């Protein structure tokens, strides 16, 4: 349990008069501070099924989660869609061999830019957030993704 000792007002950096605020946290987006994530590393995801747009915005091409975790918001079509993750300099990629990811399911983090595509059954179009934690020594690796309406 988080409990509540004596915290109510949030500390503001430098200065920012905030009289009104929107429930941004309700969009399923946790605070991503500078942590121990993969620095100097960019991730590229390409979807192919109904659209095949292969779009990857730079502003969200690589988000650092302050907790040895990686996050990247992606927008794809609805109803059976396959996607793959890979870098430009043949760096650590993602390959879901016979994984078949589902809304709110964890995916196996493998390697190789020529494996099996991950198909997700989502009858609703939109962008989902991929949250995954990576090991420090380079042994264990798990991925998790869910859809937020």
- Side by side, the strands of the sheet bearing 118-120 are 44-48, 81-86, 118-120
Token pair for residue 120? 């997700």
Q: Where are the domains of the chain?
A: 1-149
- The distance of Cα 7 from the centroid of its chain, to the nearest Å, equals 29
Q: How far apart are the C-alpha atoms of 76 and 50, rounded to whole Å?
A: 9
133 pairs with which residues across the strands?
A: 69, 142
Q: How far apart are the C-alpha atoms of 76 and 47, rounded to whole Å?
A: 7
Residues 6 or more apart in contact with residue 107 via CB below 8 angstroms: 94, 96, 99, 101, 118, 143, 144, 145
Cβ–Cβ < 8 Å for 52, 82: no
Cβ–Cβ < 8 Å for 35, 69: yes
- Side by side, the strands of the sheet bearing 69-76 are 63-65, 69-76, 126-134, 141-146, 105-108
Cβ–Cβ < 8 Å for 83, 118: yes
Cβ–Cβ < 8 Å for 47, 83: yes
Residue with tokens 């020594």: 137
Q: How far apart are the C-alpha atoms of 148 and 92, rounded to whole Å?
A: 27
- Cα-Cα-Cα-Cα torsion 57, 148, 79, 100, nearest 10 degrees, comes to 90
């Amino acid at each position: 349990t988080p409990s509540a000792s004596g915290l109510t007002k949030v500390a503001t950096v430098s200065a920012a008069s905030s009289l009104i605020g929107e429930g941004f946290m309700a969009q399923c987006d946790n605070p991503t501070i500078e942590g121990d994530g993969p620095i100097g590393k960019t991730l590229y995801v390409v979807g192919d099924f109904a659209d095949a747009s292969w779009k990857q915005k730079p502003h969200r091409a690589y988000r650092y989660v302050g907790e040895n975790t990686y996050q990247a918001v992606v927008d794809e079509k609805a109803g059976a869609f396959r996607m793959q993750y890979a870098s430009k300099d043949w760096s650590p990629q993602f390959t879901a061999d016979g994984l078949e990811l589902t809304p709110g399911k964890t995916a196996s983090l493998k390697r190789g830019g020529y494996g099996q595509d991950t198909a997700v059954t989502l009858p609703e179009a939109g962008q989902y957030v991929w949250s995954l934690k990576f090991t420090d020594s380079g042994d264990p690796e798990q991925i998790m993704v869910s859809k937020c309406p």
